[PDB]
Fold:
Amino acid sequence: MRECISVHVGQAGVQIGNACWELYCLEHGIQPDGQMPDSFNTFFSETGAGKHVPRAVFVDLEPTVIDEVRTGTYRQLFHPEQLITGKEDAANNYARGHYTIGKELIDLVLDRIRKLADQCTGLQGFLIFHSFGGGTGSGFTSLLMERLSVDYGKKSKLEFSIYPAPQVSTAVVEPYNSILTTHTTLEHSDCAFMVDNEAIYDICRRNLDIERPTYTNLNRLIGQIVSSITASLRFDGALNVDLTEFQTNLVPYPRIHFPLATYAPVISAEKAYHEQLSVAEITNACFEPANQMVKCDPRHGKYMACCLLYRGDVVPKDVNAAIATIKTKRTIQFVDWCPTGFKVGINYQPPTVVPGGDLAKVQRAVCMLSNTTAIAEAWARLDHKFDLMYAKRAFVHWYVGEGMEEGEFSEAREDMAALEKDYEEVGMDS
Amino acid sequence: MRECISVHVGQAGVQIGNACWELYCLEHGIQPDGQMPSDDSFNTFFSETGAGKHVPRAVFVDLEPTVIDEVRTGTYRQLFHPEQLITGKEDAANNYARGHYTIGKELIDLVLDRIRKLADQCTGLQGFLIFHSFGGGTGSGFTSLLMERLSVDYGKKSKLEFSIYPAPQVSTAVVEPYNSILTTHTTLEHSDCAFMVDNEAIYDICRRNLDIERPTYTNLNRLIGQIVSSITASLRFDGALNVDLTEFQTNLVPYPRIHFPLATYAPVISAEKAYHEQLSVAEITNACFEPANQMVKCDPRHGKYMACCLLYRGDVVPKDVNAAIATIKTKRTIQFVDWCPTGFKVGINYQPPTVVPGGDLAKVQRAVCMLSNTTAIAEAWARLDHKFDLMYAKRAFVHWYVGEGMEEGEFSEAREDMAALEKDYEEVGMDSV
Amino acid sequence: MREIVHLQAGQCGNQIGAKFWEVISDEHGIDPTGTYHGDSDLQLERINVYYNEATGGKYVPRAVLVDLEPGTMDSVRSGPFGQIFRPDNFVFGQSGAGNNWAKGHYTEGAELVDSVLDVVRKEAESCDCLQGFQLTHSLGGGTGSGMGTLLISKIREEYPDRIMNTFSVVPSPKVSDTVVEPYNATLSVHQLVENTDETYCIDNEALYDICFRTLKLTTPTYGDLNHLVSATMSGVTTCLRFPGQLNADLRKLAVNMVPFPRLHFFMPGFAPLTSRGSQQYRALTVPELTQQMFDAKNMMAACDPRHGRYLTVAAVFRGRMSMKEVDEQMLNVQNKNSSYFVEWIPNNVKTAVCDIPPRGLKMSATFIGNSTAIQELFKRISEQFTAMFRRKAFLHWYTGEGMDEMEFTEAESNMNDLVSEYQQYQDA
Amino acid sequence: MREIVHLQAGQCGNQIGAKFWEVISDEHGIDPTGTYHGDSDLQLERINVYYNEATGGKYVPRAVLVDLEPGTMDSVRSGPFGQIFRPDNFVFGQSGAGNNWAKGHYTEGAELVDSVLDVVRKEAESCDCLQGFQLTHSLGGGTGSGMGTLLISKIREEYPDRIMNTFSVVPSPKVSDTVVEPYNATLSVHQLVENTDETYCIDNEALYDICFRTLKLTTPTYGDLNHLVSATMSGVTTCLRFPGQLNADLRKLAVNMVPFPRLHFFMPGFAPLTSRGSQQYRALTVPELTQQMFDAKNMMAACDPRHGRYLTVAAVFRGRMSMKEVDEQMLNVQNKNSSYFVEWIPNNVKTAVCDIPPRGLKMSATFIGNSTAIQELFKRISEQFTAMFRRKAFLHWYTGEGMDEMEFTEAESNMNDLVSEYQQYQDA
Amino acid sequence: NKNQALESAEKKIQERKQEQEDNLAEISNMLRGDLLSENPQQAASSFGPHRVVP
Ligand SMILES: Nc1nc2c(ncn2[C@@H]2O[C@H](COP(=O)(O)OP(=O)(O)OP(=O)(O)O)[C@@H](O)[C@H]2O)c(=O)[nH]1
Ligand SMILES: Nc1nc2c(ncn2[C@@H]2O[C@H](COP(=O)(O)OP(=O)(O)OP(=O)(O)O)[C@@H](O)[C@H]2O)c(=O)[nH]1
Ligand SMILES: Nc1nc2c(ncn2[C@@H]2O[C@H](COP(=O)(O)OP(=O)(O)O)[C@@H](O)[C@H]2O)c(=O)[nH]1
Ligand SMILES: Nc1nc2c(ncn2[C@@H]2O[C@H](COP(=O)(O)OP(=O)(O)O)[C@@H](O)[C@H]2O)c(=O)[nH]1
Ligand SMILES: [Mg+2]
Structure:
């Protein structure tokens, strides 16, 4: 009817999938077993019986992350094959994931993805979750995206990705692994939602009170954001918004397609019962420069767009009053060629709680995919970082020997250069 | 009224027929003694006597008694007629000359006497099903001699072949390319439709589609047994769109020398996997045309699809079949020839296949078997010709053949005739402009 | 209905065959007096290949006992299974060959060969359909090398269409028993290359090396050497004794292993051979069986396979197991070691599997290899022949017994022709 | 299914492996004999990375213990976990090198490499995906220094991509067990710069320090020092064995710690090392373990990292802990100490969080740090070699073992090259 | 399809335990097999304890 295949790539992806599909299960009441004790159709298919197998393809070159799922609590939910793993990892090297170690799993994946697209009568588009700083998540993702465009045609190939953090950086080759992936995905991705980690760390400490958070808490929040990008596709709402719509009302010029996400009523239970979270309250917070998902200060750019997705009990009148207020304050500035500015999508289903989560059952919530130009600061930091290394030809042997020319690096940084120019041109006001 | 005499020749033919007749016995409720515990649909395979016995309409022939005497001392001792199981004393020893000229010519009079006894017993005979292997001596020599004797005695009666074509890499014999080229050249025009399977593909099917690791020949013969049951399901069971055995030579082989379609069985999945997915008609139709679900080890995208015959079993809807094949034809991944715009034979049956106790298959509501005649089988012949002349250039192993009553010039006659077949496929594989 | 007549000559042939009939009787469940106290009916189903019926459920082997010395018959009767053989099949001479090929072939074995042949036709023609013969002897001795080759010629002029098998024990220089053994070996390979349909070359020093480092025995006697040979004979002919999921008897092995009628000298080996201390360190799987099968260290010949190319390879297996696992392993050994197999044969390895393992074993396998590298076995014997023939070392023992100089010359000439013919097919 | 063949070479190596294997066995749960007497499930999930599997639940270690004199290996067998090792992986020689790189790399080491390479293959053959090999050895000896380098070379060729780490024990800055250390080591380093993916450099000097100022141990035995090398060992292979929040691998660690190829010489170090009395007064918190792993004293090499710039850093934290902390306690380092980390590499630290904690511990970590301080080690080994080669001292010993004099200078050059690279980057 | 999966899982466990039973009988038949034991009893002959086997 209106289904959406979800292709998670890499540890980040596999682990994000775990949180996301757990929420999906406790929303459509599908117990870990896979049964309920047509809103589910979008994400969950169905055997002749009541076994609702998910519509996902968890793929990871390393045989470990997907193995914790194969033998876990949600073991009999996922189909044994959907979980596609390899024998050795991409060793934080785009090359291996896009040329050598990743050129032997692409077949299995595109085959299975086709098998989940033959049961789809209204495939809105594919959701591709991954992290730019990793090998598979950069290499294979780029690989898949290429053949995804040629096989599944022009579909809403959206991508909830994890951009490297301003300061913190798991791997040292992150600059490289993340520039060599934009260059190829720039023309094979519709909306690349950027959600960092150091921002979510800050939220888990300031908004929720969980000090010393783990990737679990961070991943749980990511799931609530993905639940809201796909809540009008499953549940019902006054103003429903489909995946196809976002691309139109968020991506202004083609290349510029890196929106930033934001939740809203992220409060601890002890705080929940101390504030009357109003539609304005949740909206005002969804714009504050400390609840953002990337540490790019939005008070430096111009909201080239905005898509506010209200979920829960949200009277249609308040959403207007709130947006009107935002429009008043001059801090929140929008580019001149966007006089309209916002896109609203109301969904009646209230946000759900996870047995052992962090946020407290709210009555209303808002998620805002915003295309600010303040994301330029991100690539500018990354560009220097890459430049600080390519100059010394550091870690270049780890790529030239894995089916890749040195020329590619330069070619990629020229595309990175172009995007950084475009993001500036679309800023210069009339 | 719908009978067919099934000849099982060679060890591959006999051991396949053990799983075939086990499946036939479980389908019609005939115990290994031959007596039903408590209809007339068994007549196509069994012949009821005056008492409650139901002897099969089959002959088991092999030159080596170490396989048939297992049947003569096994669970199905009392099912088979003693005269119907015919053995010699020395095997053909992977010699086509021994299976055709010296040793196999001894046993051809008793087998044809037993075949004509079964044919005189039959009232509605349709064709002969012969199970053998291209890589053996008895399965290549005595099979070939049987075709010459069946053509001279029975005429244009239908003859279907279920042969183990030689795998591209795995082989259990060294002179296996010699027998494969020799038996094909002399069966090119004494055979009507020869269905192809390879051992490597079933090994891959058992590894990736079934959950079982370390597969044996027992799992191979059961999955082949499911195909022949699916081929002959329309004669025994009620069907919405019935398919005969005289059908297969009409809608699969377009030209007289090309009669090697590719058999496959798409819904081959284990029980744990079957719980995790449905088995709808569109899902089982497009699983036939997958290159990973082929029961002949050759890539179907390398060549051109010429004729396809799809047989459906179970609660299958003809509309769902019409929708599934239409989505196959609009797919550009596989392509048909221009001179055959139809390229599809449809068969619908109502009874789902019976699960055998101990089998690796699952209880399925729908089943499909596709017999596809492809141009992509030409790369198998070219590779088989490459193996033949690699030893024929130095006359390797030819002294075992010339020393057993067969002329040396037949090697230079079979390969020249096979080289014609190589670019008979090239001739039919081009579009006309 | 496929009988095998066993022949054995010499002290080495009698002692190997005495252990051979002991292993067969343990597999077929036959006590030393000759009655079947076994368990499975699958044991007493094809007993007719080796044994013959006697009154009262008694089974006598179809073997003839041939030697020129009466001292070997006392040795074979002193064994645990010495009473199973028929006394009419004991054909023993009065004067020994004395490590003389001329005495074993011309003057002393000429009157005993008629008595042996009467017993051979006695056992051959009581079979409804005889498959072939089987001879165990040593090429370094006098009785085995001389009369053994004489029996090869005289039973092939009467049974030409039957297969001929000989389990030859060729000499090796580093373990030297007799000084005149290069003379005996050179005069006997010509009778092997022209008559025997298939032959196996057994090296004593490879058996000692296997018994030293693979089985790790403190004091390996000859009975341990004969046990390794006897397990290979059982592994070769286990197809026509027990059922298998896909079979290969003696003739089908000979067809697929011999590409040209002068190329039939094999390189035997036995797979499941582990030491006592390493019994608990192994996992009884097909990959270990195949990995130890193709090892030159496990080989029962003193010529290293890495020095030549495998023309063809046979693999006869015993036990209940999978076929994909076996079929993939022979695919793996061909693909990785592609330089060790000849290019003009694309499928060098054949496979036989029987579902019944030997008693006390769950799995077993035997290795048969026709390799070019056996030409260095003959080339090292020929260089020890031309070193003695040039100075006419021990030739007055042979010349005075009725043979000429040209017989030694034509024996070396046919022997060098075989080695050069092996060399040409390695070049390809 | 990644697997690691452990080649322990030399006396030092055979004792290092004896404790390394005991330690990994205690984690996986394998007992002295080899049966899983453990209290978990993940202890047997990924055991294929280090142990094979026999019958009965015996998990034989995938290891080859090599030596030019049986002594130390016979001593290893008669020990605690001395019956796990397969009895056919103890390849040994009969004439030792005698602190002579030459004998070990050209004379007697070169008559054993063949035998070792066989065992090596067999273990690497039965490997779905051999992630790589691992050589624990000493650089101031003969079988460890010579046959070790010989093996690393022949292996590196036969097996390309496969990772090839080496836990090498380099000479001390103070006292010297072997007088010929200068030559031995200098002649070996050259090879460890060409045929090693990632070489870890442990110096006995550091062990004493971390076993006197950190472990308050008054009577340390080489075994207490060997337990430390064994802890660092597991740390670099804990994510390919037990699950984790952020997973790592030998190859991944190499990619994010080897900037330019030549530089593969790292510096290891543990984390929750604490004294007996100073055990109850601790606070196992990521904050604490990250104040030791970086503390120069807790290094396992002589090079002090205050005289050099860390080109990279690799922390492998084994312990269910707060990801935020791991991260927050990483920036702090790169920030606070800002002159001890190069600027040409933005982020100079790799992080991995394996969950299953070290036995009898809540949170541990293994740090591997490529530092331009390592130039100190080779500078010392070179200033020694210089003094010796100048007066051509014990050159004779090396010369007449199949060696020359130019190879010595070649080596010295090769060393001065690596030390130049190091300095260049340090000042770059 | 569920009872087949439970039957197949129990069959594989039963085949694994039956594999370990004849693996232990494999080893136990080697340590007493008149070849690896090297007992001085193969030298016994039918002619008597004095004559032994040559
Ligand atoms: N925000 C967030 N990020 C995560 C989470 N889990 C993993 N990550 C990210 O994943 C990255 C590491 O994953 P990868 O390097 O791709 O590991 P991998 O998928 O095995 O890739 P390879 O090792 O190269 O094969 C880190 O940078 C994390 O930021 C999560 O739950 N939330
Ligand atoms: N389907 C199937 N094929 C088999 C089986 N056993 C062997 N084969 C195949 O059959 C080919 C040879 O046939 P054989 O089984 O040896 O029987 P044959 O054709 O009579 O040949 P011989 O009896 O050995 O002279 C081999 O190449 C195998 O690929 C089996 O049990 N089932
Ligand atoms: N394998 C094996 N070889 C043996 C045995 N007995 C003797 N030989 C070999 O046979 C050779 C001597 O043969 P010989 O007894 O003189 O043969 P004969 O003259 O024909 O009886 C020696 O080189 C031995 O190595 C045995 O029991 N087993
Ligand atoms: N850490 C540690 N070092 C050791 C051990 N045993 C020996 N060594 C070192 O090994 C060096 C000597 O290497 P050597 O004994 O000559 O090895 P060889 O080549 O096998 O003879 C000495 O400098 C010791 O410091 C041990 O158990 N632990
Ligand atoms: Mg047969």
